[PDB]
Design a protein around this ligand. Structure first.
Ligand SMILES: Nc1nc2c(ncn2[C@@H]2O[C@H](COP(=O)(O)OP(=O)(O)OP(=O)(O)O)[C@@H](O)[C@H]2O)c(=O)[nH]1
Ligand SMILES: [Mg+2]
Length: 171
């Protein structure tokens, strides 16, 4: 099929850069301001290994350890991008919680999860190492990657990887 349609949900603690990361991939530029997100939805094309896709990304509202995981993100989503900020020990802690909640609701289903460490560029304020994010991602059997909403290439690879992990379970 010339074109496949896959829906992606982007979850994580507030201000980690879910929007920026998404904007970078879709529009191509790095938005420098900060407007908390209620929920934006972009539909962009992207080819992964010759297969073109009609990617529908759901850039969700930041969540914290207490917030309840929304049910519409619980069904009919082909892949999840769980992102956190390497400049925040808090985003990392919260992501572990959101991951568990996600798995609960999704029931016993083979849904592809991918962990992303954002703000790779903010060297001076990095508080989490690469190896720590990796370990976690390995505890989940999820593809791990670090990225920078300013480094467009790293933003494209995040969404490219989720597709890659998607097709894997399908097959
Ligand atoms: N230096 C740097 N700043 C970033 C990066 N990614 C995001 N930011 C900044 O982090 C702040 C918040 O980014 P957002 O994309 O709004 O984060 P968010 O998770 O969408 O925010 P919520 O919708 O509330 O969850 C903004 O100032 C972004 O410009 C990055 O890779 N490097
Ligand atoms: Mg936002």
């Amino acid at each position: 099929p010339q074109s496949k349609s896959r829906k992606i949900a982007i979850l994580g603690y507030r201000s980690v850069g879910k929007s920026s990361l998404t904007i970078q991939f879709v529009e191509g530029q790095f938005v420098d301001s900060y407007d908390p997100t209620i929920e934006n939805t972009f539909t962009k094309l992207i080819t992964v290994n010759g297969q073109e896709y009609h990617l529908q990304l759901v850039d969700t509202a930041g969540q914290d350890e207490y917030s309840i995981f929304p049910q519409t993100y619980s069904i009919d989503i082909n892949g999840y991008i769980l992102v956190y900020s390497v400049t925040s020990i808090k985003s990392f802690e919260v992501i572990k919680v959101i991951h568990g909640k996600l798995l609960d609701m999704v029931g016993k289903v083979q849904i592809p999860i991918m962990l992303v460490g954002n703000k790779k560029d903010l060297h001076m304020e990095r508080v989490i190492s690469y190896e720590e994010g990796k370990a976690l991602a390995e505890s989940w059997n999820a593809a791990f990657l670090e990225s920078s909403a300013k480094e467009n290439q790293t933003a494209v690879d995040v969404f490219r990887r989720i597709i890659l992990e998607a097709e894997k379970l399908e097959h």
